[PDB]
Design a protein around this motif. Structure first.
Motif, PDB file in Angstrom:
ATOM      1  N   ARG A  49       0.825  -1.193   0.000  1.00 21.50           N
ATOM      2  CA  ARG A  49       0.000   0.000   0.000  1.00 21.50           C
ATOM      3  C   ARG A  49       0.869   1.256   0.000  1.00 21.50           C
ATOM      4  O   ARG A  49       1.970   1.267   0.580  1.00 21.50           O
ATOM      5  CB  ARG A  49      -0.960   0.002   1.188  1.00 21.50           C
ATOM      6  N   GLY A  50       0.323   2.301  -0.614  1.00 20.46           N
ATOM      7  CA  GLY A  50       1.034   3.472  -1.165  1.00 20.46           C
ATOM      8  C   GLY A  50       2.518   3.557  -1.542  1.00 20.46           C
ATOM      9  O   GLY A  50       3.201   4.410  -0.978  1.00 20.46           O
ATOM     10  N   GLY A  51       3.065   2.818  -2.516  1.00 23.28           N
ATOM     11  CA  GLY A  51       2.420   2.149  -3.638  1.00 23.28           C
ATOM     12  C   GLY A  51       2.318   3.127  -4.808  1.00 23.28           C
ATOM     13  O   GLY A  51       1.445   3.987  -4.799  1.00 23.28           O
ATOM     14  N   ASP A  52       3.201   3.038  -5.800  1.00 25.19           N
ATOM     15  CA  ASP A  52       3.042   3.888  -6.979  1.00 25.19           C
ATOM     16  C   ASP A  52       1.842   3.361  -7.773  1.00 25.19           C
ATOM     17  O   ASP A  52       1.719   2.144  -7.991  1.00 25.19           O
ATOM     18  CB  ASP A  52       4.320   3.954  -7.834  1.00 25.19           C
ATOM     19  N   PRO A  53       0.925   4.269  -8.165  1.00 19.24           N
ATOM     20  CA  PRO A  53      -0.351   3.850  -8.733  1.00 19.24           C
ATOM     21  C   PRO A  53      -0.320   3.388 -10.174  1.00 19.24           C
ATOM     22  O   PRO A  53      -1.271   2.751 -10.621  1.00 19.24           O
ATOM     23  CB  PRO A  53      -1.245   5.093  -8.596  1.00 19.24           C
ATOM     24  N   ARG A  54       0.779   3.667 -10.881  1.00 19.45           N
ATOM     25  CA  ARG A  54       0.905   3.255 -12.262  1.00 19.45           C
ATOM     26  C   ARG A  54       2.295   2.681 -12.507  1.00 19.45           C
ATOM     27  O   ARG A  54       3.086   3.269 -13.240  1.00 19.45           O
ATOM     28  CB  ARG A  54       0.625   4.426 -13.220  1.00 19.45           C
ATOM     29  N   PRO A  55       2.584   1.499 -11.946  1.00 20.76           N
ATOM     30  CA  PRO A  55       3.892   0.879 -12.195  1.00 20.76           C
ATOM     31  C   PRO A  55       3.985   0.404 -13.630  1.00 20.76           C
ATOM     32  O   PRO A  55       2.958   0.024 -14.237  1.00 20.76           O
ATOM     33  CB  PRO A  55       3.876  -0.320 -11.249  1.00 20.76           C
ATOM     34  N   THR A  56       5.193   0.385 -14.212  1.00 18.91           N
ATOM     35  CA  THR A  56       5.367  -0.177 -15.549  1.00 18.91           C
ATOM     36  C   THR A  56       6.121  -1.534 -15.469  1.00 18.91           C
ATOM     37  O   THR A  56       7.049  -1.676 -14.689  1.00 18.91           O
ATOM     38  CB  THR A  56       6.037   0.890 -16.476  1.00 18.91           C
ATOM     39  N   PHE A  57       5.682  -2.539 -16.227  1.00 19.93           N
ATOM     40  CA  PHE A  57       6.378  -3.811 -16.283  1.00 19.93           C
ATOM     41  C   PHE A  57       6.781  -4.108 -17.713  1.00 19.93           C
ATOM     42  O   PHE A  57       6.156  -3.630 -18.678  1.00 19.93           O
ATOM     43  CB  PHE A  57       5.517  -4.961 -15.766  1.00 19.93           C
ATOM     44  N   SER A  58       7.841  -4.897 -17.872  1.00 17.68           N
ATOM     45  CA  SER A  58       8.217  -5.392 -19.183  1.00 17.68           C
ATOM     46  C   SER A  58       9.091  -6.608 -18.961  1.00 17.68           C
ATOM     47  O   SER A  58       9.558  -6.845 -17.826  1.00 17.68           O
ATOM     48  CB  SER A  58       8.939  -4.295 -20.005  1.00 17.68           C
ATOM     49  N   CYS A  59       9.235  -7.402 -20.021  1.00 17.74           N
ATOM     50  CA  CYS A  59       9.945  -8.665 -19.996  1.00 17.74           C
ATOM     51  C   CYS A  59      11.049  -8.630 -21.055  1.00 17.74           C
ATOM     52  O   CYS A  59      10.904  -7.942 -22.068  1.00 17.74           O
ATOM     53  CB  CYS A  59       8.924  -9.747 -20.301  1.00 17.74           C
ATOM     54  N   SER A  60      12.175  -9.311 -20.804  1.00 20.35           N
ATOM     55  CA  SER A  60      13.264  -9.427 -21.806  1.00 20.35           C
ATOM     56  C   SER A  60      13.557 -10.883 -22.009  1.00 20.35           C
ATOM     57  O   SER A  60      13.525 -11.666 -21.019  1.00 20.35           O
ATOM     58  CB  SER A  60      14.584  -8.903 -21.304  1.00 20.35           C
ATOM     59  N   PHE A  61      13.945 -11.204 -23.248  1.00 19.46           N
ATOM     60  CA  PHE A  61      14.386 -12.537 -23.638  1.00 19.46           C
ATOM     61  C   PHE A  61      15.900 -12.491 -23.783  1.00 19.46           C
ATOM     62  O   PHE A  61      16.403 -11.705 -24.579  1.00 19.46           O
ATOM     63  CB  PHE A  61      13.835 -12.973 -24.989  1.00 19.46           C
ATOM     64  N   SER A  62      16.627 -13.293 -23.004  1.00 22.86           N
ATOM     65  CA  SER A  62      18.061 -13.340 -23.088  1.00 22.86           C
ATOM     66  C   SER A  62      18.555 -14.626 -23.799  1.00 22.86           C
ATOM     67  O   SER A  62      18.285 -15.756 -23.362  1.00 22.86           O
ATOM     68  CB  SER A  62      18.674 -13.042 -21.688  1.00 22.86           C
ATOM     69  N   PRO A  63      19.170 -14.458 -24.995  1.00 25.80           N
ATOM     70  CA  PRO A  63      19.533 -15.657 -25.742  1.00 25.80           C
ATOM     71  C   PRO A  63      20.634 -16.422 -25.009  1.00 25.80           C
ATOM     72  O   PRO A  63      21.518 -15.801 -24.391  1.00 25.80           O
ATOM     73  CB  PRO A  63      20.039 -15.101 -27.089  1.00 25.80           C
ATOM     74  N   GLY A  64      20.549 -17.744 -25.048  1.00 28.95           N
ATOM     75  CA  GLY A  64      21.612 -18.609 -24.534  1.00 28.95           C
ATOM     76  C   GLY A  64      22.876 -18.546 -25.389  1.00 28.95           C
ATOM     77  O   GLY A  64      23.986 -18.368 -24.866  1.00 28.95           O
ATOM     78  N   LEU A  65      22.669 -18.661 -26.702  1.00 33.76           N
ATOM     79  CA  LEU A  65      23.684 -18.496 -27.742  1.00 33.76           C
ATOM     80  C   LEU A  65      23.050 -17.601 -28.824  1.00 33.76           C
ATOM     81  O   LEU A  65      21.890 -17.802 -29.167  1.00 33.76           O
ATOM     82  CB  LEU A  65      24.047 -19.878 -28.337  1.00 33.76           C
ATOM     83  N   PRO A  66      23.792 -16.604 -29.359  1.00 41.49           N
ATOM     84  CA  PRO A  66      25.170 -16.230 -29.057  1.00 41.49           C
ATOM     85  C   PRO A  66      25.222 -15.069 -28.072  1.00 41.49           C
ATOM     86  O   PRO A  66      24.208 -14.761 -27.431  1.00 41.49           O
ATOM     87  CB  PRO A  66      25.710 -15.796 -30.431  1.00 41.49           C
ATOM     88  N   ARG A  67      26.403 -14.456 -27.950  1.00 40.16           N
ATOM     89  CA  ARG A  67      26.628 -13.263 -27.128  1.00 40.16           C
ATOM     90  C   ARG A  67      25.844 -12.144 -27.790  1.00 40.16           C
ATOM     91  O   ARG A  67      26.329 -11.437 -28.669  1.00 40.16           O
ATOM     92  CB  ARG A  67      28.135 -12.971 -27.030  1.00 40.16           C
ATOM     93  N   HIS A  68      24.604 -12.008 -27.349  1.00 46.11           N
ATOM     94  CA  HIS A  68      23.599 -11.230 -28.054  1.00 46.11           C
ATOM     95  C   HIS A  68      22.739 -10.423 -27.127  1.00 46.11           C
ATOM     96  O   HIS A  68      22.319 -10.895 -26.080  1.00 46.11           O
ATOM     97  CB  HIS A  68      22.700 -12.170 -28.895  1.00 46.11           C
ATOM     98  N   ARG A  69      22.487  -9.193 -27.553  1.00 45.74           N
ATOM     99  CA  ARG A  69      21.446  -8.310 -27.070  1.00 45.74           C
ATOM    100  C   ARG A  69      20.188  -9.027 -26.674  1.00 45.74           C
ATOM    101  O   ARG A  69      19.731  -9.957 -27.372  1.00 45.74           O
ATOM    102  CB  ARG A  69      21.090  -7.384 -28.227  1.00 45.74           C
ATOM    103  N   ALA A  70      19.615  -8.596 -25.561  1.00 44.43           N
ATOM    104  CA  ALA A  70      18.312  -9.113 -25.125  1.00 44.43           C
ATOM    105  C   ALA A  70      17.222  -8.506 -26.001  1.00 44.43           C
ATOM    106  O   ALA A  70      17.418  -7.451 -26.571  1.00 44.43           O
ATOM    107  CB  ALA A  70      18.070  -8.773 -23.645  1.00 44.43           C
ATOM    108  N   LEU A  71      16.086  -9.172 -26.092  1.00 44.46           N
ATOM    109  CA  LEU A  71      14.943  -8.681 -26.844  1.00 44.46           C
ATOM    110  C   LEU A  71      13.861  -8.291 -25.841  1.00 44.46           C
ATOM    111  O   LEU A  71      13.525  -9.087 -24.985  1.00 44.46           O
ATOM    112  CB  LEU A  71      14.413  -9.786 -27.775  1.00 44.46           C
ATOM    113  N   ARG A  72      13.325  -7.075 -25.916  1.00 47.11           N
ATOM    114  CA  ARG A  72      12.357  -6.676 -24.894  1.00 47.11           C
ATOM    115  C   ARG A  72      10.960  -6.441 -25.386  1.00 47.11           C
ATOM    116  O   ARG A  72      10.794  -5.883 -26.449  1.00 47.11           O
ATOM    117  CB  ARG A  72      12.833  -5.420 -24.146  1.00 47.11           C
TER     118      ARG A  72
END
Ligand SMILES: [Zn+2]
Ligand SMILES: [Zn+2]
Ligand SMILES: [Zn+2]
Ligand SMILES: [Zn+2]
Length: 219
Positions: A177-200
């Motif tokens: 409780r109080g508590g930011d009223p508009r939190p933002t969420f997001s997810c990233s995909f981290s590749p196993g191979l290769p040494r690569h940028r995550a995708l969000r």
């Protein structure tokens, strides 16, 4: 001693046979131990065939795979009689990968209720090899799946007909409780191979509802 090669699924690969003469005739042999067949497969100059694929020995003695796939992971060895006179060895270990599409959040909540656990949404990645992983952010900061009032249910599923993976990560939060009223969420995909940028994923922004109680008995 074995040289590691990384190759994207779908794409051609050329492996050099060190010490092979530049053109035929050549005394050389490639021996391969790959995928799900246990026996070594032997190739020599020709070499030959396919098309449409797979592996062929080129005029210069190199090994050619027209489009690499998961079944091409493993050991590639060449032995060649030098020009002249003694033998040169080549030994490769090939691994492969696919980058999946951009990850997506399905079934996102528009509203969360503070003080109880809430399903935020499920992040889905389709079509990776090897599996790789998913992870969450809250306002751009890392969520640890184990911290106070955060939990994650994860699934990895392999397509038996392609070898590619589908990942799922279902985030559950219990907002204080109080508590930011508009939190933002997001997810990233981290590749196993290769040494690569995550995708969000694109972010979601549910609103946090705090139901106000004055409804308990003095016992
Ligand atoms: Zn066996
Ligand atoms: Zn759904
Ligand atoms: Zn992060
Ligand atoms: Zn890339």
């Amino acid at each position: 001693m074995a040289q590691n090669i990384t190759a994207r699924i779908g794409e051609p690969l050329v492996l050099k046979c060190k010490g092979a003469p530049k053109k035929p005739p050549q005394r050389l042999e490639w021996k391969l131990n790959t995928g799900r067949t246990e026996a070594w497969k032997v190739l020599s100059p020709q070499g030959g065939g396919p098309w449409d694929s797979v592996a062929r020995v080129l005029p210069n003695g190199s090994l050619f795979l027209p489009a690499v796939g998961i079944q091409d992971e493993g050991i590639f060895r060449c032995q060649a009689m030098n020009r002249n006179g003694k033998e040169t060895k080549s030994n490769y270990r090939v691994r492969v990968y696919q980058i999946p599409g951009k990850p997506e959040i399905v079934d996102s909540a528009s509203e969360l209720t503070a003080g109880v656990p809430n399903k935020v949404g499920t992040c889905v990645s389709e079509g990776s090899y090897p599996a790789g992983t998913l992870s969450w952010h809250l306002d751009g900061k890392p969520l640890v799946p184990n911290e106070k009032g955060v939990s994650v249910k994860e699934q990895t599923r392999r397509h038996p007909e392609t070898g590619l993976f589908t990942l799922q990560s279902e985030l559950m939060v219990t907002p204080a409780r109080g508590g930011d009223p508009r939190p933002t969420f997001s997810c990233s995909f981290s590749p196993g191979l290769p040494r690569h940028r995550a995708l969000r994923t694109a972010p979601i922004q549910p609103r946090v509802w705090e139901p106000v109680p004055l409804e308990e008995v003095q016992l």
